[PDB]
Design a protein around this ligand. Sequence first.
Ligand SMILES: CCCCCCCCCCCCO[C@@H]1O[C@H](CO)[C@@H](O[C@H]2O[C@H](CO)[C@@H](O)[C@H](O)[C@H]2O)[C@H](O)[C@H]1O
Ligand SMILES: CCCCCCCCCCCCO[C@@H]1O[C@H](CO)[C@@H](O[C@H]2O[C@H](CO)[C@@H](O)[C@H](O)[C@H]2O)[C@H](O)[C@H]1O
Ligand SMILES: CCCCCCCCCCCCO[C@@H]1O[C@H](CO)[C@@H](O[C@H]2O[C@H](CO)[C@@H](O)[C@H](O)[C@H]2O)[C@H](O)[C@H]1O
Ligand SMILES: CCCCCCCCCCCC
Ligand SMILES: CCCCCCCC
Lengths: 48, 48, 49, 48
Amino acid sequence: SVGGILRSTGRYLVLYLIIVVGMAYLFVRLPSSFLPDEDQGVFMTMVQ
Amino acid sequence: ERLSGNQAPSLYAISLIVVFLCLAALYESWSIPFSVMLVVPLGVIGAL
Amino acid sequence: MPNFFIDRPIFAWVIAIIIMLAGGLAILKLPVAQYPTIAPPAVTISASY
Amino acid sequence: VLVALILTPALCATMLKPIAKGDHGEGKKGFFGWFNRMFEKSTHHYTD
Ligand SMILES: CCCCCCCCCCCCO[C@@H]1O[C@H](CO)[C@@H](O[C@H]2O[C@H](CO)[C@@H](O)[C@H](O)[C@H]2O)[C@H](O)[C@H]1O
Ligand SMILES: CCCCCCCCCCCCO[C@@H]1O[C@H](CO)[C@@H](O[C@H]2O[C@H](CO)[C@@H](O)[C@H](O)[C@H]2O)[C@H](O)[C@H]1O
Ligand SMILES: CCCCCCCCCCCCO[C@@H]1O[C@H](CO)[C@@H](O[C@H]2O[C@H](CO)[C@@H](O)[C@H](O)[C@H]2O)[C@H](O)[C@H]1O
Ligand SMILES: CCCCCCCCCCCC
Ligand SMILES: CCCCCCCC
């Protein structure tokens, strides 16, 4: 199977650039944060 | 928030350079390190 | 070691560039002054009557 | 000393021009030709 892929060569370079454009799209779409808020089994309530 | 920010692209840029250089020393080739470094998007795409 | 890097000039160049890169990054974040701390420290007690 | 044991020999092996047997820069043209003749002459004076 790999032997057949090396005869193509240029066809998989185009498929690679699809993966990189897909990677680039998903990276900009995915919104960032620092650390998740965990359920620590306790919380508080302010009364003002 | 005001004391610095968005410093990861600077540190990852040099990280790519030092990985290129280490690979270049391993194989004794300026060209061959690119064959390793082109696999970086293959991991990132699945994570995203 | 000399013989090693004669046949491997890229390895030799890599070590140099990593030393130069690390030095370049140092110059950005290093403090700047006329001198270092060279005066001995002093503590003063002040009082009023 | 680390540069002189690692880098310097690697450059001498690759980026130095060949010098034929006998040539001590005495047949150079201009100021350098004068300097090499003067210096080779001064080396003889010095050794004696
Ligand atoms: C076994 C290999 C060890 C090789 C040691 C020689 C290389 C020295 C490290 C690389 C030098 C360049 O990188 C330099 O590193 C020093 C580390 O003290 C950083 O200095 C740092 O000090 C402390 C941590 O100790 C941090 O809180 C501070 O934010 C930072 O300034 C410089 O900001 C950086 O510019
Ligand atoms: C091969 C020749 C070697 C010649 C060596 C001569 C070096 C002399 C350096 C002394 C002066 C250094 O002065 C130092 O400059 C760097 C930028 O370059 C500044 O750096 C500052 O600006 C840059 C942007 O320009 C920021 O990315 C950085 O976060 C900030 O700290 C330092 O705040 C300053 O203190
Ligand atoms: C004590 C004070 C220092 C001395 C200053 C007064 C000079 C006294 C003579 C000492 C020698 C001076 O060094 C001077 O260098 C020039 C370099 O161009 C030499 O000239 C040399 O280069 C030219 C340029 O193509 C050639 O054509 C020539 O064949 C060659 O000799 C002079 O021959 C020499 O007179
Ligand atoms: C033996 C290889 C000859 C080419 C030398 C490359 C020089 C790289 C200079 C890097 C400057 C930071
Ligand atoms: C005499 C052989 C020493 C080889 C050392 C090479 C490691 C850089």
